[PDB]
Design a protein around this nucleic acid. Structure first.
Ligand SMILES: Nc1nc2c(ncn2[C@@H]2O[C@H](COP(=O)(O)OP(=O)(O)O)[C@@H](O)[C@H]2O)c(=O)[nH]1
Ligand SMILES: [Mg+2]
Ligand SMILES: [Mg+2]
Ligand SMILES: [Mg+2]
Ligand SMILES: [Mg+2]
Ligand SMILES: [Mg+2]
Ligand SMILES: [Mg+2]
Ligand SMILES: [Mg+2]
Ligand SMILES: [Mg+2]
Ligand SMILES: [Mg+2]
Ligand SMILES: [Mg+2]
Lengths: 135, 213, 25, 62, 67
RNA sequence: GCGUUGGAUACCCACUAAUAGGGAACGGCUGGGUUUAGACCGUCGUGAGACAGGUUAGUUUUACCCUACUGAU
RNA sequence: CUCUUAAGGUAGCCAAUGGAUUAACGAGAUUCCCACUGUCCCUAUCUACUAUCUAGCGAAACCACAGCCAAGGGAACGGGCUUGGCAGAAUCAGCGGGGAAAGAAGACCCUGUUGAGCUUGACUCUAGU
RNA sequence: GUGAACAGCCUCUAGUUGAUAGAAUAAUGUAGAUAAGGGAAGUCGGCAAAAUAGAUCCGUAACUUCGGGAUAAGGAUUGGC
RNA sequence: AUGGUGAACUAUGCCUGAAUAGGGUGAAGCCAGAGGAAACUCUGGUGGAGGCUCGUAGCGGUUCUGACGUGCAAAUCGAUC
């Protein structure tokens, strides 16, 4: 029952309420398994102004064609970016950074934008953030 | 603010050199009549290690030109110098490794060491192990010699300044990793109290300007 | 999104993808 | 020297200037950064309210 | 969920016909024996599950078929 | 009048006749907390530092006095 | 003017390896298993030194005055005030409910000063240059 | 002497026999032990105790900087004549 | 603020002295044997390296609902480390 506690879900709703962009982190080995469809439905029903994208992490654990096929299939629904999180030897960091800069330029009226990382446990949200910060 | 170690070191105290085991200051002979006009022959009696110095030293015995006795000098050993070797020092000395010659008496491209900055100061340049001074050129009208120093700088000095033919022995010393704080400890025990070093950021703002956070 | 060139990604060299550890050969 | 003083800096670049305005902060920067220590009430020796706390005024509006 | 070749390459074992045999062979090869010669089934199983989750065993779910 | 439990991590499992609610605090030991000095990460600050925060380590030691109570001359 | 879904059948090309998912070490922080057991169900028994009694020796903290309770007395809240319960010498061992009984007595908020050998284009300065 | 041993235990030479004592053996303590059946159900938490231990032989995995891990783990034995 | 006194504790440098059982592991160099055109590989010995390791003296001070708290002691005692 871990991951279904009221404190955790209150934290999730807090980060969604504070976020302009929401990155849903998926595991390249089981992306449909690690999807929060109810959270996506709530976002598209109640907060349509918040921008939801997919980051398919741990793409180094699957063959290249598997990751390409998953990216192609998930792009039919949401903008999906392949990723491999590491401080030193990573993949997709520049693409994520330029996409975030595009979002920042789109919300130029806002003085800053917040990007909240949500998903299943152990999918690598903290690793992706450490990859972006190089620390 | 509190006085930092950089400012504290000027008062001497515990920051003086550890000189008990030294062999003596390494100098050339005093520039005298014999070295100014002809040459003088000494003999290498021994080659010894000096505490706190990477390069070995050579004890060279000359005869006193004005009194019946012997004079012992401590030179910095060039590579290839051996015990029992004859060393010639003066204006008329030959161009062989270990000999002491004025800079104006050697051709371009000559490699020297323990070079005098001024004529008579008994050696100032290229004394550490593996280092040397290159004779770039001469200016006879001003009685000057252009040389290249180990740091890469180009300098003009007197042609009467003296230098020892060859390169200082013991080269390649710093290519070996120490591997150990203990080996660094024994290295600086024979030199001075400058080890270990504490970072300024790790200190308080009172101790160092880099402190705090 | 830009181009996602997956041919510049090196997969992890896991022990189960190495033919040197073959069993029954 | 006379070049690093506040008066000389103002020439290079009356009552409108506020406390804490320096080479790094202007008036708006100073007040926004004082927001983080703003929320306190002021009392005197006898305990009377010199100034109420921010967003804690007790007067009943009409 | 895992391929036989991938499992045998990872754990240097073979010859099993079921999960109990796989656990027993792995425990006897790795020396995970309890006091009295009994293999440590629970410990070996926990280590296998940890390796599966943390990515020391290659595996993936097949993507949807192309159109 | 008489009882109202044993466990797992406010909710479950089980036993049971039953696993009722509450007060004497919230107008002796003991863990979370007021945890001061050491340390690291995050946010803000030109900085000294502060905090949207997160982690770890961290001395207070009566009773022989009166009464009350339990027993005893 | 334009941008992203071309990659395909369980491990690719591209440059032994593609690494920080880093060995070893640690009175560092955390989780689990075997063994083991009085940690517990559920407590019992044994030894020494005390405590206890005696001969000798012999302090200290603390002390407005004192010392049985109930109700009411203009925020909580009495040993003394009002109304009641009551109440018989002198005492011993325990005990920790209560006692401006002590020891914890200091931490925590508020006001007014002072210091900082704190820091900054705060002000007058000034060593050094 | 035992023993790998300036370890622990006992002894020779030498040196002490000092520390207020006597009488009883309640509770509660300080220090040390044992316990049927169950075996962490206790507790925030296996805190504390228990279990292990010398030597000989068999045998010893992942990982790894190839040096280690390692006494890994897991088994058998020990007297006297 | 002015003028003086302290490095018998402790912090650090220097000079001259002194102290530190018994085990485990087994680096380079060397010898012999089996291979090889050589380089080099394998087996058995020898040797005794390491800011290695177990563990006394010693140095230090992790833990205990530890002892003690007008204590033996203005920082001590026991076990453990
Ligand atoms: N191979 C691989 N492993 C990853 C990647 N990202 C994360 N991991 C691993 O996944 C583990 C859990 O990651 P973490 O960031 O804590 O997951 P989180 O719960 O989403 O924050 C870490 O130990 C990482 O080593 C990736 O891109 N590739
Ligand atoms: Mg500090
Ligand atoms: Mg603190
Ligand atoms: Mg009476
Ligand atoms: Mg029992
Ligand atoms: Mg339990
Ligand atoms: Mg319980
Ligand atoms: Mg191990
Ligand atoms: Mg001294
Ligand atoms: Mg050592
Ligand atoms: Mg050791």
């Amino acid at each position: 029952s871990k991951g279904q506690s009221k404190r955790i879900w209150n934290e999730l709703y807090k980060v969604i309420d504070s976020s302009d962009v929401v990155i849903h982190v998926l595991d390249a080995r089981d992306p449909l398994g690690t999807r929060c469809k109810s959270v996506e439905e709530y976002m598209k029903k109640e907060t349509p102004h918040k921008h939801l994208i997919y980051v398919l992490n741990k793409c180094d654990l699957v063959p290249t064609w598997v990751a390409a096929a998953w990216v192609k299939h998930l792009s039919k629904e949401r903008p999906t970016l392949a990723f491999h999180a590491s401080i030193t030897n990573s993949f997709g960091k520049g693409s994520l950074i330029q996409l975030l800069r595009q979002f920042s330029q789109l919300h130029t009226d806002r003085k800053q934008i917040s990007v909240g990382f949500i998903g299943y446990p152990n999918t690598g949200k903290s690793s992706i953030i450490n990859t972006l910060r190089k620390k | 603010g509190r006085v930092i170690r950089n400012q504290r070191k000027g008062a001497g105290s515990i920051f003086t050199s550890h000189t008990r085991l030294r062999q003596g200051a390494a100098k050339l002979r005093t520039l005298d009549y014999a070295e100014r006009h002809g040459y003088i022959r000494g003999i290498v009696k021994q080659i010894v290690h000096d505490s706190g110095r990477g390069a070995p030293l050579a004890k060279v015995v000359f005869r006193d030109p004005y009194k019946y006795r012997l004079r012992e000098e401590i030179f910095i050993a060039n590579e290839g110098v051996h015990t029992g070797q004859f060393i010639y020092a003066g204006k008329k000395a030959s161009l062989n490794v270990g000999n002491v010659l004025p800079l104006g008496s050697v051709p371009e491209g000559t490699i020297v060491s323990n070079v005098e900055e001024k004529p008579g100061d008994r050696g100032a340049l290229a004394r550490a192990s593996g280092n040397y001074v290159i004779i770039i050129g001469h200016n006879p009208d001003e009685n000057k010699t252009r040389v290249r120093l180990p740091s890469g700088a180009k300098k003009v000095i007197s042609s009467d300044a003296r230098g020892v033919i060859g390169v200082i022995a013991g080269g390649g010393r710093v290519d070996k990793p120490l591997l150990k704080a203990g080996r660094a400890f024994h290295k600086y025990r024979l030199k001075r109290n400058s080890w270990p070093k504490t970072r300024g950021v790790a200190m308080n703002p009172v101790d160092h300007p880099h402190g705090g956070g | 999104m830009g181009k996602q060139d997956l041919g510049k990604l090196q997969t992890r060299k896991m022990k189960g993808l190495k033919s040197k550890f073959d069993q029954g050969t | 020297g006379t070049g690093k003083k506040e008066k000389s800096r103002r020439i290079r670049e009356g009552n409108l200037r506020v406390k804490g305005e320096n080479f790094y902060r202007d008036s708006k920067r100073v007040k926004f950064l004082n927001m983080y220590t703003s929320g306190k009430e002021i009392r005197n020796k006898k305990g009377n309210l010199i100034r109420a706390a921010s967003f804690q005024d007790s007067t009943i509006p009409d | 969920r895992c391929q036989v070749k991938h499992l045998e390459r990872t754990y240097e074992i073979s010859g099993w016909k079921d999960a109990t045999e796989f656990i027993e062979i792995l425990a006897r090869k790795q020396g995970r024996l309890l006091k009295g010669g009994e293999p440590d089934e629970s410990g070996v199983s926990k280590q296998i599950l940890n390796d599966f989750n943390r990515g020391k065993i290659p595996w993936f779910v097949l993507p949807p078929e192309k159109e």
